[PDB]
Design a binder for this molecule. Structure first.
Ligand code: TDI
Ligand code: TDI
Ligand code: CL
Ligand code: CL
Lengths: 237, 231
């Protein structure tokens, strides 16, 4: 993950200010770059060099941010953190989800025989780094958290039950969670050969009341994702 | 004076690429950037790849490495306005995502939080494109262009766009992404594309036959517009 004779620098991307604020507060020797509407915080988290990006919401905002983070901070790994819609049958608010793979749920070029969710020039899904997944699962065991590991799907929609949800469940019956940035970040990471992993926490279960649940439990998810990410950064260094 | 040009597919950029004198190429983040002069105007031509993220990645790279003064998005498009036929020109006055949906929290359909509901194209770039259309005597429509990560092929996907965006004149997969990135860096932007299909049940067949015609017409427009803006 890091070349010999150097320290690793960990990239951490969150979409919303709510998702990054706790981490931001814990950074020592913090400096801020405001670039292309994104904000990046650099410094140390418990002695490890980090670059924390608040990207804004959705696929383009996250691609833009990830690109900026890579060009300006050149991190060795990226961790995408935040909240997620829990799709897997045993998930509850505050549970952790770790990506083994990411895919776009709203990409459709099947008229030319690409797989549902696949964009031309891309693999059908992006596999997360094995070493980062292993590190996160060790964190989950040591912290004694409830987690699931699986496919995370991304689109530009907040999933709120009805036909939006039923579409995803049809096309990706094994997806464990849904959000709006992760696959975009994975896509950018793929193009630069940067190890990537998603570590998020459940704010809602993507059903008819997901907007109510999100408005009540984003804070819980931010807190649990933050604990995971702080723990992981230490394990990685 | 430096003009950025972005197309998604090699087929969309190949004619312009061949025309650049003193050409240099940089391959980065999976994208290719070509630099040089196009009919005596300094350009940076990006081949981004297909879709919103590929285009956002590419546009970001173009900006940070080449710092163009304006960006023109070129290529093909699915025609939505009834007057359009294959080969006709569409120019953006505005772009919107047709697949963005955060309406559960009261954002407008197509709007992402932190963004305007849609991105207005640069008025001077639009006026300049309309003068090229006039002088070349081309058939053209000016209006809303919508973007998503789907190739539109009739049925329910077309019906949804027509319902949410009844005055959209064309659909594609990159333009709003590029507009979004340009909005963030205050870079003037316009889309000048040409029709390859009408986004109906046969759009895949039309695309496979007429992509080259659309590349030819969009390329003619872009060449003219670059000369006009620079000279
Ligand atoms: C204010 S838009 C929601 C923000 C929170 N993010 C994750 C998420 C939680 N629940 C989700 C769901 N049901 N559908 C899609 N995404 C999510 C994505 C976006 O930044
Ligand atoms: C091989 S994917 C198609 C490529 C050409 N681009 C424009 C386009 C033409 N017709 C379209 C349509 N019916 N639906 C969506 N987009 C388009 C989008 C993408 O780069
Ligand atoms: Cl699946
Ligand atoms: Cl409309």
């Amino acid at each position: 993950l890091v070349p010999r004779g150097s320290h690793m620098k960990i990239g951490i991307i969150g979409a919303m200010e709510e998702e990054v604020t706790l981490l931001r507060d814990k950074i020592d020797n913090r400096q801020t770059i405001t670039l292309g509407g994104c904000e990046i915080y650099t410094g140390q988290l418990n002695g490890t060099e980090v670059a924390l990006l608040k990207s804004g919401i959705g696929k383009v905002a996250a691609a833009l941010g990830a690109t900026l983070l890579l060009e300006h901070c050149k991190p060795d790994v990226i961790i995408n953190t935040g909240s997620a819609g829990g799709l897997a049958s045993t998930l509850k608010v505050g549970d952790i989800v770790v990506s083994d793979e990411t895919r776009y749920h709203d990409a459709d070029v099947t008229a030319f025989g690409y797989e549902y969710g696949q964009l031309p020039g891309c693999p059908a899904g992006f596999k997360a780094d094995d070493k980062l997944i292993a590190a996160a699962e060790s964190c989950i065991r040591e912290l004694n958290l409830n987690a699931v590991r699986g496919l995370i799907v991304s689109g530009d929609a907040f999933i709120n039950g009805s036909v939006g949800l039923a579409k995803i469940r049809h096309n990706f019956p094994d997806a464990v969670a849904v959000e709006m940035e992760a696959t975009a970040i994975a896509h950018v990471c793929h193009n630069f050969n940067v190890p990537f992993v998603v570590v998020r926490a459940i704010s809602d279960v993507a059903d008819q009341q997901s907007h109510l649940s999100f408005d009540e439990f984003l804070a819980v998810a931010a807190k649990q994702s933050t604990l995971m990410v702080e723990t992981l950064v230490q394990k990685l260094a």
